[PDB]
Structure 1
Amino acid sequence: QPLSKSTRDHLQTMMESVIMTILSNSIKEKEEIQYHLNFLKKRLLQQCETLKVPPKKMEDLTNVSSLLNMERARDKANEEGLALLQEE
């Protein structure tokens, strides 16, 4: 299975951001380096679109961390309740 479209768009956004950042500190040789970096970005986009992965669900990159925190809290609450139950 090809790469998930959400992952492709996320990766493309990160490549755009990093290319803007690496262009910010470049003063001279702007046009040639930006053309080369654009070619690099498009070849990477083609490679990642063509790339194949086994059918494993992989959720959005940004939100997962937050989920973990909530999940952690859930377990804590569960543990607390468990303790209370055992106490009873």
Structure 2
Amino acid sequence: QPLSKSTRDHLQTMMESVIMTILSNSIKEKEEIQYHLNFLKKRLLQQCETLKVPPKKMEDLTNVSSLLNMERARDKANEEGLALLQEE
């Protein structure tokens, strides 16, 4: 299975951001380096679109961390309740 479209768009956004950042500190040789970096970005986009992965669900990159925190809290609450139950 090809790469998930959400992952592709996320990765493309990160490549755009990093290319803007690496262009910010470049003063001279702007046009040639930006053309080369654009070619690099498009070749990477083609490679990642063509790339194949086994059918494993992989959720959005940004939100997962937050989920973990909530999940952690859930377990804590569960543990607390468990303790209370055992106490009873």
What's the TM-score bracket when you normalise by the shorter of the two chains? over 0.9
Q: Which runs of 5+ in 2 are unaligned?
A: none
1:60-87: CA deviation from partner (whole Å, max 9, x where unpaired) = 0000000000000000000000000000
Gaps of 5+ in 1: none
Shift of 1:26: 0.0
Deviations 1:35-60 (A, max 9, x none): 00000000000000000000000000
Identity among equivalent pairs (%): 100
Q: How well do the aligned residues superpose, as a CA RMSD in angstroms? A: 0.0
Counterpart secondary structure, 1:33: helix
TM-score normalised by L of structure 1: 1.00
Q: In structure 2, how many angstroms separate the alpha carbons of the residues matched to 1:48 and 1:65?
A: 24
The DSSP-based 3-state class of the residue aligned with 1:47 is helix
Displacement after TM superposition at 1:33 (Å): 0.0
Where has structure 1 moved over 4 Å in runs of 4 or more? none
Rounded to whole Å, the distance in 1 between the matches of 2:58 and 2:22 is 29
Q: Which SS does the other structure have where 2:11 is aligned? A: helix
Q: Aligned to 2:53, what secondary structure does the other structure show?
A: coil
Q: 2:21 — aligned with what? A: 21
Q: TM-score, normalised to structure 2's length?
A: 1.00
